[PDB]
């Protein structure tokens, strides 16, 4: 047996009124398949939604422990194993996911094999083991048949563009996803639907469409019970408030911290968001990570030093940043910091150049502001605001 089955049996023995409770929770709307799952191995609910919802209702503190057990005992050829592959990737449960992947690419079910190879390309691109070009070639050679993998083969590229600061391709690509074509696996349709809400929120943020950004993150929050998506929804809402509402930005990031207590990665992300927030508002900054050599954290060290005219320390940090490789969006922030430290308009022009290249219409407001404060000609600023980079 699996841990989850054992626990449900035990708990049912102590309290029968649970099954009705589970019945409504699992979307089973008929305790029948509940009985069948408990009593007979290999029984799976029609939708992975059912066991997920029960685990979250009855054993929320044990979700990972139980699901790693359940998922890694499923028949890899099944719809449950495919749904579990998406459950694992959505939650960033890379253990469940990678083992399910190496099992599915070997197996003899074509649907599971296809899911496995596509998610494999996603994980390899995410870990920078392959380039985007090689990912695209591999996806093409797979001759994808299922609508789910047609959608996810686009989603994985969107994740890559977002994480590499290459925002210009995203809007057109995300419009090409058609989730309504997914009819067999409602768990994957609904989870992918949340994925699209969160990605859309990020695209709107990068277009400086702030109200739409928050609308899509609200939709994401309503649509899911997956922590990962809740985290990035609060992150993006808070980011959208960075230049306007300090208290509400802070409140969204603090909400993120409160749901991140047991996840170090998500906690660090919200500390970074608060760090950036407090630098934008030139406040004393209690969130800086002084034990990091990532560009993200070092940049915020330099930003804070610049804000308080500790120019020697700022220069030492920018020296460190000089000896690290930057993407276009990261480089745009670098030139912004250099421009503020040196009071050098040419740095703000370079910052603007790289914000245009990454197609970041949100953070470009920082160098534009600085140029305006230094007395830049008005028509010129209007040109720098409105012209765009040819991609």
């Amino acid at each position: 047996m699996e841990l989850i089955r054992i626990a449900m049996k035990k708990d049912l023995e102590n309290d029968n009124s649970l099954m009705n409770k589970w019945a409504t929770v699992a979307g089973l709307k008929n305790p029948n398949p509940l009985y069948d799952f408990l009593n007979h191995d290999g029984k799976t609910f029609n939708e992975f939604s059912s066991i997920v919802n029960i685990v979250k209702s009855q054993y929320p503190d044990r979700e990972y422990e139980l699901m790693k057990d359940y998922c890694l005992n499923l028949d890899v050829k099944t719809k449950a194993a495919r749904s579990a592959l998406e459950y694992a990737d959505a939650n960033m449960f890379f253990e469940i996911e990678d083992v399910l992947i190496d099992s599915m690419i070997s197996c003899s079910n074509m649907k599971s094999k296809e899911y496995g190879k596509v998610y494999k390309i996603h994980r390899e691109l995410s870990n920078s083991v392959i380039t985007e070009f090689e990912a695209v070639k591999r996806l093409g050679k797979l001759n994808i048949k299922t609508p789910e993998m047609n959608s996810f083969s686009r989603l994985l590229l969107l994740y890559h563009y977002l994480s590499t600061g290459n925002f210009s391709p995203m809007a057109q690509l995300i419009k090409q996803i058609d989730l309504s074509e997914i009819s067999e696996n409602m768990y994957i349709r609904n989870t992918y639907q949340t994925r699209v809400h969160v990605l859309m929120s990020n695209i709107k943020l990068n277009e400086n469409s702030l109200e739409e950004c928050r609308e899509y993150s609200k939709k994401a929050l309503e649509s899911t019970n997956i922590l990962r998506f809740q985290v990035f929804s609060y992150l993006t809402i808070g980011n959208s408030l960075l230049f306007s509402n300090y208290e509400l930005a802070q409140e969204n990031f603090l909400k993120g911290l409160s749901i991140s207590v047991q996840n170090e990665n998500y906690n660090m992300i919200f500390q970074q968001a608060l760090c950036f927030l407090n630098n934008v508002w030139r406040k004393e900054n209690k969130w800086i990570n002084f034990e990091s050599d990532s560009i993200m954290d070092l940049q915020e060290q330099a930003h804070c030093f610049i804000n308080f005219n500790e120019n020697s320390k700022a220069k030492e940090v920018l020296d460190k940043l000089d000896l690290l490789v930057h993407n276009d969006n990261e480089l745009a922030m670098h030139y912004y910091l250099k421009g503020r430290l040196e009071q050098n308009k040419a740095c703000f022009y370079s910052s603007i150049e790289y914000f245009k290249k990454s197609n970041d219409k949100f953070l470009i407001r920082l160098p534009l502001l600085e140029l305006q404060k230094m007395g830049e000609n008005q028509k010129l600023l209007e040109l720098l605001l409105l012209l765009e980079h040819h991609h």
């Binding site: 969160v198 993006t236 993200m296």
Partner: peptide, 6 residues
């Protein structure tokens, strides 16, 4: 920088 994610 500003953290981003989805």
């Amino acid at each position: 920088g500003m953290p981003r994610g989805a």
